[PDB]
Amino acid sequence: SNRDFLEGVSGATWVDLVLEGDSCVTIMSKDKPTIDVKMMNMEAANLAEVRSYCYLATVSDLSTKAACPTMGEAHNDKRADPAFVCRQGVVDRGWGNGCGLFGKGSIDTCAKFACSTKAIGRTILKENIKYEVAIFVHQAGRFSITPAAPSYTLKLGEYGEVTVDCEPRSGIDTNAYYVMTVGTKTFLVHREWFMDLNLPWSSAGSTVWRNRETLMEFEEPHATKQSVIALGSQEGALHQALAGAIPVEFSSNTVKLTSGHLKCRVKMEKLQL
């Protein structure tokens, strides 16, 4: 279809060509055979973690310390363990619970925070983006091209060979977007919108979830103890506010895109008459 058609170059050993998200290009000339050049695909290689959010916490290890009035600030001992989230509170007190003076007693409730599902955010750049470039002769074979090592010489045997310098510009603003992964569906979040979500988040290979309260409800106090729960899945209310992003497939540690194109110098010189 989009199979363009060019001609070597005015008595020269080169050609300057360009490809789209799909287009291929035939290059003809007197002496040398014709060479169908296609840009098969482009993928992101080995994406690194930048920040994964939680969307289904597990709350365990409850434990609420207390104190009447005139007994100061109740302090939960677990308040010394990072895994625990603690919210000092206040509750009615009186004779009915071992206090000689009706009034607001201190209270400190602690609970461990654990994550059950992470929305892992990843990043890419020049040092990892591949570019499939099939080459035919009229017998063929494909290969990949990076902004790091753009050129590539393909041995064609009895046909000859071809250098193929390149300039792998794309469409996406690299270092401006991220690869979000909610459940199985993968998406393309916009820079800030990502690190602007109100949810518990690990960092770079970190084991430290921050902004945790977001997912657990500290329920109505109760002289004795205080019930604490974790909120249901966010997957739902995360898909809902995330459909405008670009739906993609994170098939096997790689990413298929579309917004790409190459300007390549085809050194047909090495090609056999």
Partner: antibody, heavy 121, light 107 residues
Framework: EVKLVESGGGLVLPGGSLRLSCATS????????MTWVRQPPGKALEWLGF??????????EYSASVKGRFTISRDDSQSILYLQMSTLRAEDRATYYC????????????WGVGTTVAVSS | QIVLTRTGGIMSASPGEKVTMTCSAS?????MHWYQQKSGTSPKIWIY???KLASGVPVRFSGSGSGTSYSLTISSMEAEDVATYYC?????????FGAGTKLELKR
């Protein structure tokens, strides 16, 4: 440890006023209730009033002997206690103590030096 | 108001000797506290909720009491026990102290 140092004691005429201070340290002032107790030159020991903490709306309670005459205030920002005093007379002559309150069933644990209040012309 | 009339206004005790002061109350009561004041010093909490000994307090001291009758007892009198001892009531308002029991070492 704890520090309860009274201040603002002197001689005053039968009817005058005075504001007693209890500068504290070595603990979280706001957290605890607080009380004033006076000891007359006669050993007897009179509770005057206490004042709750922030979370208890600074609830206060006074003894029959101090209705109107005095009122207690808390400078939670600097761990300071005050006992504003007005229209003193013969009976108010004493040594005024400033103690914290504590325990499930309240008791005055850490008292202070005390401060001397004389009423005469 | 509930008045705490103390039994044993003043008393002497020979070292090693067991001592007992009484706190009589003009009305029922829940708990009773005891304070120790040594000449010059400001009071100190000593017995709280009838029988729980304050901290630092020697295990020699002890308190019993229920309703309107309460007492503290030194197991074996000793010089450092020389002081005045006051009882405080809590069950009612206002808060009340007793007159105090002066304790002297009979040396």
């Amino acid at each position: 440890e704890v520090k309860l140092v009274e201040s603002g004691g002197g001689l005053v005429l039968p009817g005058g006023s005075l504001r007693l201070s209890c500068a504290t340290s070595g603990f979280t002032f706001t957290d605890y209730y607080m009380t004033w107790v006076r000891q007359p030159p006669g050993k007897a020991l009179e509770w005057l009033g206490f004042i709750g903490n922030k979370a208890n709306d600074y609830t206060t309670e006074y003894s029959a002997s101090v209705k109107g005459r005095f009122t207690i205030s808390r400078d939670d920002s600097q761990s300071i206690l005050y006992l504003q005093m007005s229209t003193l007379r013969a009976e108010d002559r004493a040594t005024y103590y400033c103690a914290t309150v504590y325990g499930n069933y309240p008791y005055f644990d850490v008292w202070g030096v005390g401060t001397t209040v004389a009423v005469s012309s | 108001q509930i008045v705490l009339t103390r039994t044993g206004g003043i008393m002497s005790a020979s070292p090693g000797e067991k001592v007992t002061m009484t706190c009589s109350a003009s009305s029922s009561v829940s708990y009773m506290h005891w304070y120790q004041q040594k000449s010059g010093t400001s009071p100190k909490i000593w017995i709280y909720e009838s029988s729980k000994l304050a901290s630092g307090v020697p295990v020699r001291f002890s308190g019993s009491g229920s309703g309107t009758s309460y007492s503290l007892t030194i197991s074996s009198m000793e010089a450092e026990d020389v002081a005045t001892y006051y009882c405080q009531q809590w069950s009612s308002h206002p808060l009340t102290f007793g007159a105090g029991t002066k304790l002297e070492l009979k040396r």
